[PDB]
Structure formats: structure tokens, C-alpha cells
Amino acid sequence: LAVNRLFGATETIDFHPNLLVYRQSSPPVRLTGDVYVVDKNEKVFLVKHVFSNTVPAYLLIRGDYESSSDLKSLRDLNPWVQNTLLKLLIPD
Amino acid sequence: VNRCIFASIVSFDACITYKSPCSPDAYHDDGWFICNNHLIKRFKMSKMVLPIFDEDDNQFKMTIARHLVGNKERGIKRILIPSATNYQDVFNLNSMMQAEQLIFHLIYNNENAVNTICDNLKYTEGFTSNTQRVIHSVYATTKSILDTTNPNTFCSRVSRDELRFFDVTNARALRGGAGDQLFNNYSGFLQNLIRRAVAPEYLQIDTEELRFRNCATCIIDETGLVASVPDGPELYNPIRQPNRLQIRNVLKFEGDTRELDRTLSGYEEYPTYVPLFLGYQIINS
Amino acid sequence: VNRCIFASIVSFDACITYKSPCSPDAYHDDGWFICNNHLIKRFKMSKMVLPIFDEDDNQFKMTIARHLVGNKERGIKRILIPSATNYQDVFNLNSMMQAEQLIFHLIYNNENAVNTICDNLKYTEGFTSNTQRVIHSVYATTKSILDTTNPNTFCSRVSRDELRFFDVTNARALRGGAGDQLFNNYSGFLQNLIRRAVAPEYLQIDTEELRFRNCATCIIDETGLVASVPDGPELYNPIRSRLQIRNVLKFEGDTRELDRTLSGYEEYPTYVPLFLGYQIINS
Amino acid sequence: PQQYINSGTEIPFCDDAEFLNRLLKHIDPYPLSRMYYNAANTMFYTTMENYA
Amino acid sequence: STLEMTQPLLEIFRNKADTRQIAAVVFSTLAFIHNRFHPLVTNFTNKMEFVVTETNDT
Numbered sequence: 001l002a003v004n005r006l007f008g009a010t011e012t013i014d015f016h017p018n019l020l021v022y023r024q025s026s027p028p029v030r031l032t033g034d035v036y037v038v039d040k041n042e043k044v045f046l047v048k049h050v051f052s053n054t055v056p057a058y059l060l061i062r063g064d065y066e067s068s069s070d071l072k073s074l075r076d077l078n079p080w081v082q083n084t085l086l087k088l089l090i091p092d
Numbered sequence: 093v094n095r096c097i098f099a100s101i102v103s104f105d106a107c108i109t110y111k112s113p114c115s116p117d118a119y120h121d122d123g124w125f126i127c128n129n130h131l132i133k134r135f136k137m138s139k140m141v142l143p144i145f146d147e148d149d150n151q152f153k154m155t156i157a158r159h160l161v162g163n164k165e166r167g168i169k170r171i172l173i174p175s176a177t178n179y180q181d182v183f184n185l186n187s188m189m190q191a192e193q194l195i196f197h198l199i200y201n202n203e204n205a206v207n208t209i210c211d212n213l214k215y216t217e218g219f220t221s222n223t224q225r226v227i228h229s230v231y232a233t234t235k236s237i238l239d240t241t242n243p244n245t246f247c248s249r250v251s252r253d254e255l256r257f258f259d260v261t262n263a264r265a266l267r268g269g270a271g272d273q274l275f276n277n278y279s280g281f282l283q284n285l286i287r288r289a290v291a292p293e294y295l296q297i298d299t300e301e302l303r304f305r306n307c308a309t310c311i312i313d314e315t316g317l318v319a320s321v322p323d324g325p326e327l328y329n330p331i332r333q334p335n336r337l338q339i340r341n342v343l344k345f346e347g348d349t350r351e352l353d354r355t356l357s358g359y360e361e362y363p364t365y366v367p368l369f370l371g372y373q374i375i376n377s
Numbered sequence: 378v379n380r381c382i383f384a385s386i387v388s389f390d391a392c393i394t395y396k397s398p399c400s401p402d403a404y405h406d407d408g409w410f411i412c413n414n415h416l417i418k419r420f421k422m423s424k425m426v427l428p429i430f431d432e433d434d435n436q437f438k439m440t441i442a443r444h445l446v447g448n449k450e451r452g453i454k455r456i457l458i459p460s461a462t463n464y465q466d467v468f469n470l471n472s473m474m475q476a477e478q479l480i481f482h483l484i485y486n487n488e489n490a491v492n493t494i495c496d497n498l499k500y501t502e503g504f505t506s507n508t509q510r511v512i513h514s515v516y517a518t519t520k521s522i523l524d525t526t527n528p529n530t531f532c533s534r535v536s537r538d539e540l541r542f543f544d545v546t547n548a549r550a551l552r553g554g555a556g557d558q559l560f561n562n563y564s565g566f567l568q569n570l571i572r573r574a575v576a577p578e579y580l581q582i583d584t585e586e587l588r589f590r591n592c593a594t595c596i597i598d599e600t601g602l603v604a605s606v607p608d609g610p611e612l613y614n615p616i617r618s619r620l621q622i623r624n625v626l627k628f629e630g631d632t633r634e635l636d637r638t639l640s641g642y643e644e645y646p647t648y649v650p651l652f653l654g655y656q657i658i659n660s
Numbered sequence: 661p662q663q664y665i666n667s668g669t670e671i672p673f674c675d676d677a678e679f680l681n682r683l684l685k686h687i688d689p690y691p692l693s694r695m696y697y698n699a700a701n702t703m704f705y706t707t708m709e710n711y712a
Numbered sequence: 713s714t715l716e717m718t719q720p721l722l723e724i725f726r727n728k729a730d731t732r733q734i735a736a737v738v739f740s741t742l743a744f745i746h747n748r749f750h751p752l753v754t755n756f757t758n759k760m761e762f763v764v765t766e767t768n769d770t
């Protein structure tokens with residue numbers, strides 16, 4: 001979520017990196033909007049999205065998924081999502 | 093036999109790995125006197141022919157060159173061939189190999205060649221040892237080739253007529269232009285190089301003229317040959333095994349829509365290059 | 378499948394059979410709908426492609442013609458395309474077959490000629506076979522392309538996304554301008570053909586303009602396309618396929634080994650590609 | 661098919677001789693001779709595990 | 713060891729989502745065997761592919 005808060009879960013899955021399908025995809029890929037390189041090396045990126053014209057969120061992805069030149073710094077983002085990502089990376 | 097001037101180039105050192113790459117050019121023979129690899133390394137140009145057409149089988153095609161200067165290059169970077177006043181600034185002599193520096197100096201025919209290099213080696217073991225023989229012998233051979241290329245006097249190879257001209261009318265028609273002065277100052281070797289490279293936009297046949305381009309490709313500067321045009325923007329420059337991880341996904345086992353690329357490749361595809369036109373030629377009986 | 382509008386040629390009667398048919402390119406898809414055979418047959422040009430790398434193997438690519446006209450020709454001899462005013466006298470349609478004539482009259486919207494032709498067909502057995510529906514199917518194809526083109530294409534590009542100027546950059550080239558205004562007069566089909574056959578002098582990509590050539594090879598014309606330089610003598614045409622003169626004052630050299638020495642080196646093709654106009658694209 | 665081997669000219673190798681010898685010394689103690697019998701027997705049993 | 717072992721071997725096959733790493737491993741094994749029989753570098757028919765028999769019925 002961009003800003004909203006979850007409710008009503010009764011059970012959780014532990015994150016594991018193997019969940020993150022590295023889609024080998026196809027040589028030509030192009031994407032638009034602000035993009036944030038989570039890792040140059042692992043081809044990991046975050047992208048703005050909005051469901052139902054009203055649900056701001058960011059989409060993680062891992063794959064070719066090339067983009068416009070307009071690469072943006074993660075430094076700029078909100079502390080809330082930043083801390084969330086900081087845990088979820090689990091560089092541990 | 094070898095004929096590239098730069099194929100001579102070897103020097104005393106602990107080095108056992110001299111890298112002279114000189115192309116088949118050296119055993120070809122058409123008055124370039126230097127291999128394309130040196131034309132690349134120092135002059136960012138490629139050798140060519142204009143297919144001069146003839147209705148007769150005797151097409152009598154002609155020599156040409158085209159430059160490789162990038163569109164981003166500026167000023168000195170766009171200078172193709174400096175003048176004596178500029179080459180020493182343009183090229184890092186000290187990084188360049190000693191003998192190569194000397195060769196450049198002598199091609200400019202500057203006294204500074206002997207003023208500096210011929211004295212400064214005194215301390216060197218190479219100056220003391222037999223390799224001084226090799227050094228000054230290569231010097232002698234180079235001077236020989238230079239004098240061969242020298243046109244200036246009747247007691248020599250060259251004789252009789254010359255008719256090429258340059259400095260053709262500026263659009264804004266600023267009077268004249270020393271470019272001929274530069275031409276004369278430049279060693280006849282360099283003049284022959286210019287003759288090899290530079291097409292005229294017009295050929296005045298004896299009693300007839302033909303024209304081949306709208307507008308000039310090149311301009312000349314007292315500081316050196318300029319990769320530039322008088323007007324508008326610079327033209328677009330035509331751009332230039334172990335195991336690996338990047339092994340492809342499976343995809344459609346199909347060729348799919350190649351109509352466009354196939355028909356385009358069936359059409360002829362443009363030779364996107366930069367022929368050097370600058371000047372004017374005449375003929376008479 | 379076949380699409381050259383001249384490949385769509387049909388005969389109302391048993392005599393003629395057009396037995397020099399369209400080039401294989403008629404089955405291709407450039408959206409020109411003309412075989413290059415016909416392109417030579419009627420206009421004296423040959424089509425070509427330019428690849429342009431986008432700093433990658435990926436490319437935008439463009440199609441361009443060369444003209445096929447000599448240095449000595451003048452006036453009508455130099456005309457490549459007419460005005461609606463003068464296609465008649467340019468072509469001598471009467472010497473052309475009635476199907477050709479009627480097709481031209483379609484292009485030029487000549488209702489009067491259409492009416493005359495239909496009024497002649499009224500009594501013909503080709504009309505008894507209602508073969509006119511061949512013409513009407515040609516029309517259906519054309520009109521569909523026009524509803525995809527004439528209000529579309531440039532007219533749909535009235536939107537900022539794109540513009541071409543065919544006017545000469547050099548205002549000193551007085552012959553430009555007014556012709557770039559006249560451009561509006563011609564059928565959008567013709568406009569599409571010309572524009573997708575003539576290189577711009579510049580492209581505005583808001584990234585960076587590029588200048589493809591020093592100076593335009595061609596110029597807009599008061600009636601229709603003419604193979605002419607903007608100024609000066611015409612550049613040497615690479616001419617290729619009575620007691621007259623054939624004089625060519627060759628150079629004297631008998632040397633031949635130089636040719637074998639030089640074959641390894643760039644042999645610049647001599648064609649006359651068509652450059653003119655300022656092109657613009659958003660983004 | 662489930663992938664595309666690019667399948668052109670490719671061979672991997674590495675050259676850090678000192679590294680490799682360090683590895684060797686790390687590996688040295690193990691009575692591989694004795695041990696690998698277990699893996700052989702594993703493959704054998706797998707021969708029947710293959711099917712039921 | 714060169715092949716970007718961000719994971720132990722066991723993990724690789726215990727996963728099924730990937731095929732890429734598995735294919736690469738198989739290929740390299742074949743290469744090693746071939747070379748050990750042929751003390752000479754080889755690259756052969758440059759078109760080869762793999763499929764995983766992911767089910768008992770296969």
C-alpha cells in the first residue's frame with residue numbers, strides 16, 4: 001500500500017526470496033513513469049501504480065522490464081514505505 | 093613489398109611486443125603510403141572510391157575518403173588535421189612513442205625535430221649502442237620517402253602541371269581564404285594526401301562541367317582541417333565468446349511478422365556515410 | 378495476397394492482357410499499393426529504405442525513393458508528377474487504356490470524365506456483364522484507404538503529436554513556401570505517398586534535432602513534383618537503363634591494376650535520393 | 661521446449677590457481693574412497709524407487 | 713562455483729519454478745564430460761534444448 005493500512009488478515013506467509021519470479025521475459029521491454037532500481041544486479045525495480053483509479057500503491061518486479069530513462073532515487077520516497085521495504089528486504 | 097610509412101616504426105626498448113598492425117595496404121600500392129590502421133589511429137577516416145561512372149567500360153573510378161568524427165566532438169576534437177602551430181598541442185607527444193613524435197616533427201619539416209630529439213638522446217643507452225644505427229637509418233629511409241613525395245623541384249619525380257583548387261565560394265562570400273597558403277606550407281606529402289581524399293563538388297571537364305553535391309561537406313582552418321560546415325548544425329555522425337549467464341527463455345517457435353523487414357531489405361539500403369567534398373577541379377586539353 | 382492497385386487491373390474485353398505484370402513487391406506491405414515496376418513505368422523512381430539505430434539494435438526506419446531522370450531534360454521532361462490541371466496533357470490518357478484513364482480520373486476526382494465513361498459503358502457488353510463492379514471494388518478499396526488516410530494520417534496529425542514542413546529551410550530559396558502551402562490541395566493519398574517517399578532535411582525529436590543532409594535535393598513545385606535541385610546545375614544523374622553523338626572525353630590512363638587494388642574499399646553508391654522538409658515528432 | 665539455449669560458442673572456466681589449491685586443501689581429509697560408496701548405493705536404490 | 717551461487721545446490725532442485733539454472737548446470741556437466749574425453753575445446757551443434765518431466769506420468 002502507498003499509505004493505507006491492512007485489516008482482517010488471520011494468517012501470514014513468511015517472505016522468502018524464491019517467491020520473486022525472475023521473469024526472463026523477452027529482449028524488448030519498455031516501461032514508463034517513475035521507476036526505482038531496487039537492485040541493478042538482480043534486475044529489481046519498483047513502479048508506481050493505482051488500482052481502480054483510487055488505490056495508490058507500488059509494484060515490485062524482477063526481470064527485464066526496461067523503462068524510460070527517468071530513473072528516480074529511492075531516497076525520495078516516504079518513510080513509511082521505506083521502513084516497510086527496509087524490513088522486507090531482510091538483508092539477513 | 094611493404095610500403096606503409098608507419099610499418100617502418102620500431103624503437104629500442106625492453107619491449108618485445110611491438111604492435112605494428114599495418115594492413116594489407118602496405119603490399120597494396122595506390123599512393124596512400126600509409127595503412128588504414130594508422131589512418132584510423134590518428135585521423136579518424138576511412139579510404140574509399142567514388143565509382144566515377146562512364147558509359148564506357150572504362151569507369152576510371154577515383155579515390156575518396158570519409159571521416160568518422162562523432163557529432164558530440166567539439167573544437168580541437170573536430171579538428172581533423174592540425175597545422176604545425178597546433179599538432180603539438182593536439183597530440184600528447186610524450187604519450188606518443190618517441191620515433192613517432194620525431195616522424196611527425198619531420199613531416200611538419202620543423203627544425204625543432206633536430207633541435208630537441210637529435211640532442212636529447214645523448215644520455216640514453218640506446219643512443220650509445222648499435223641501435224642508434226637502426227634509429228638514424230629509419231630516419232634516413234623516412235627522409236628518403238619524404239623526398240620521393242616532394243614535388244617542389246624539376247630535379248625530382250614531379251614535373252609539369254597541376255590544376256586543383258579549393259576555397260570555393262563561401263555562401264556568405266567572404267573574400268578569398270588563406271587555405272591555399274596553408275596548402276603550400278603543408279609538405280607536398282600532405283598535399284598529395286588532400287588530393288587523394290578531397291572530392292570537388294564540381295568537375296569542370298574540358299569544355300564541360302558536372303556537379304555532384306548540393307553543398308560542401310568540409311571547411312578549412314589555418315589551425316587545421318575542420319570537421320565542420322559553414323552553416324546550420326553539424327550533421328548527424330553515422331554511428332559505429334566465453335560462457336555467459338544470459339541464456340534465453342523459450343519463446344514462440346515461429347518467425348512471425350517479418351513482412352516489413354523483408355521488403356525493406358529487398359529494397360536497397362542507404363549508405364549512410366560522410367564523403368569529404370571540398371573544392372573545385374578543372375580540365376583542359 | 379496482392380494489393381498493387383495496378384495489379385488490380387482488369388480487361389473488359391478479350392484483346393489486351395497487360396502481360397508485363399506487377400513486380401513481386403505488389404504482394405508486400407509498404408502501404409504504397411504500387412509495384413516498383415509501375416513506379417518506374419509511370420514516374421521514374423525507385424524506392425529505398427534508411428535504417429536509423431536508436432542507440433541500439435532497435436531502429437526507427439524510413440522509406441525513400443530515388444528519381445531516375447537525366448541531366449539534360451528540362452521542363453515537362455523534368456516533371457515527375459502533374460497538377461490536376463495538367464495530368465491530361467502530361468500523360469495523353471487517350472493513348473493509355475480506358476481503365477488507366479478512369480483510374481486517373483478517380484484520383485483527380487474528375488466527375489465529368491467518370492460520367493462520360495459510364496455513359497459510354499451504358500451500351501457496352503462489359504456493362505452487360507456489370508464489369509463496372511471491378512471499378513467499384515477498386516473504389517471500395519481506395520475509399521477505405523481514404524477513410525483511413527485523408528481525414529486521417531496528416532489530417533489526424535493536425536494534432537500536435539506530429540508535423541512535417543516541406544518548405545525549404547533557406548528562405549533565400551524563394552521557390553519554397555507557396556508550394557508547401559499548395560500541399561493542402563493534393564489528395565491525402567498522394568500526400569501520404571510523397572511524404573513516405575521523401576526524406577526530411579531535419580527531424581525534431583525533442584530529445585535532439587537531427588540534420589540528415591546539408592541541403593535538400595528536391596523542391597516543391599507549382600503543379601507537381603519535378604526532379605530539380607533548388608538551385609544551380611543539376612547534379613550528375615547516375616544514368617542507366619541513330620548516328621547521334623556519344624562523346625565522353627575519357628581520361629587517358631590505361632592502368633587497370635589500380636581497380637583490383639581499390640575494389641576492397643568503399644564504393645560510394647551514386648543515386649539521387651530525395652531530401653526535403655522539416656519533420657517533427659512529439660517525444 | 662522450455663528454454664532457449666543460446667547454444668553458441670561458450671565454455672566456462674576460472675584460473676585462480678591459488679584459490680583452487682586452497683579448495684583442494686580444504687577438501688583433503690575426507691576418505692572419499694570409502695564415502696562415495698554410499699552415493700553409489702543411493703543411485704542403486706533410486707533404481708527401484710523410480711517406480712512402484 | 714563460478715555460476716552465481718546465491719544458493720546451495722539443494723535449494724536449486726528443491727525449487728521447481730526455475731528451469732534456467734537447471735538447464736545451465738546440465739549443459740556444463742555435459743561439456744565437462746566431453747572435454748575430459750577430448751582434451752580439446754569444443755562447441756558443437758549450436759541448437760540444443762531441454763524439457764523437465766515434471767510429473768510421474770511423464
Ligand SMILES: [Zn+2]
Pocket residue numbers: 096097098099113114115117118126127128129130
Ligand atoms: Zn601500416
Ligand SMILES: [Zn+2]
Pocket residue numbers: 381382383384398399400403411412414415
Ligand atoms: Zn503494379
